[PDB]
Structures are given as structure tokens and as C-alpha cells.
Amino acid sequence: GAMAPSYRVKRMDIAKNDEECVVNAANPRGLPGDGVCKAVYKKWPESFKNSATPVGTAKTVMCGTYPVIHAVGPNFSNYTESEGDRELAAAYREVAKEVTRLGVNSVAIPLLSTGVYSGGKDRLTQSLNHLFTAMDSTDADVVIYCRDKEWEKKISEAIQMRT
Ligand SMILES: [Cl-]
Numbered sequence: 001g002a003m004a005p006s007y008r009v010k011r012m013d014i015a016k017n018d019e020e021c022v023v024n025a026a027n028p029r030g031l032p033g034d035g036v037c038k039a040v041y042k043k044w045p046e047s048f049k050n051s052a053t054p055v056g057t058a059k060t061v062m063c064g065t066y067p068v069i070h071a072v073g074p075n076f077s078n079y080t081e082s083e084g085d086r087e088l089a090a091a092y093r094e095v096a097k098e099v100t101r102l103g104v105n106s107v108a109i110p111l112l113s114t115g116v117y118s119g120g121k122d123r124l125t126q127s128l129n130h131l132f133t134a135m136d137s138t139d140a141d142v143v144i145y146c147r148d149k150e151w152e153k154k155i156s157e158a159i160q161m162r163t
């Protein structure tokens with residue numbers, strides 16, 4: 001476990017993370033994809049061997065000894081708001097199980113379903129709150145990765161408001 005488990009946010013490419021494992025914002029088919037998924041494919045391509053897994057699940061594949069947790073959020077283009085919200089919660093719960101099983105002291109994590117799976121809506125708060133519900137019972141240091149300057153400020157504010 002971490003000595004004083006924390007949340008932090010950084011605005012940079014998650015493929016350059018300083019944590020003991022990474023969460024990929026994967027597609028269900030284990031394809032290279034776009035955005036976070038394509039950065040993860042370039043950095044850890046070996047982790048895409050048999051990485052396909054259903055929506056609402058996470059599947060870990062090692063790249064050497066470095067764990068890549070492939071977490072499949074719902075595409076809100078296809079899911080109803082109700083069923084998508086349930087699957088997005090479930091994906092983060094499966095991430096927390098994997099992080100616990102691996103015994104890591106730190107994890108790098110993107111906001112699932114906030115990019116091309118957002119169905120054209122701002123889901124910062126929805127996705128971050130499901131991240132917190134799952135990860136609050138874990139003792140890993142959690143480092144959230146984002147790319148937008150305004151999102152960095154809002155995630156930082158949300159972390160600080162609980163402390
Ligand atoms: Cl960067």
C-alpha cells in the first residue's frame with residue numbers, strides 16, 4: 001500500500017506516467033484504437049495480446065513486468081444514459097479489483113468514456129465520481145491523467161474539495 005494514499009492530477013500523456021501500472025481506456029476488441037488507447041499501443045504493444053474484454057470489465061496483460069489494465073467504458077453513442085452510467089461505474093469497480101490483486105502502490109488512470117465514447121457530452125464529473133467510488137477503498141496512490149487545461153483545473157478542484 002502507499003504510506004498516505006493520495007489522489008493527484010497531471011496534464012500530460014499517460015504513456016509517460018511515473019506509476020507502477022497503467023489503466024488503458026480500451027475498446028472491447030483489443031484494437032490499437034485512438035487517443036489514450038493508441039498512445040498505450042505505441043508504448044506497450046505486447047500488452048494487447050488477448051486483451052479483448054467486454055464493456056464494463058477490465059483485463060490485465062503484462063508488458064514485461066509492467067501491468068496494463070485494459071478498462072472498457074461504454075460508448076454513450078450506443079448506450080442509453082441509464083445503461084451507460086451503470087457500465088461506466090462497473091468498469092471502474094473492475095479496475096479497483098485489478099489494482100488490488102496486482103499489489104501495486106500506484107496507478108495511472110484516465111477518465112473513462114470522456115473522449116470519443118462521450119456521445120458528444122461533457123462527462124468529467126460523472127466519470128471522475130465513478131473513479132472515486134471505486135478507488136476510495138484502495139490504498140494505491142492514484143494519478144489521474146488528462147490533456148485539457150480547464151479539465152486539469154476542475155479535476156484538481158474536485159480532489160481538493162474532499163481534502
Ligand atoms: Cl506530454
Ligand SMILES: [Cl-]
Pocket residue numbers: 025112113114115116117118
Ligand atoms: Cl473515451
Ligand SMILES: [Cl-]
Pocket residue numbers: 146147148151
Ligand atoms: Cl482531457
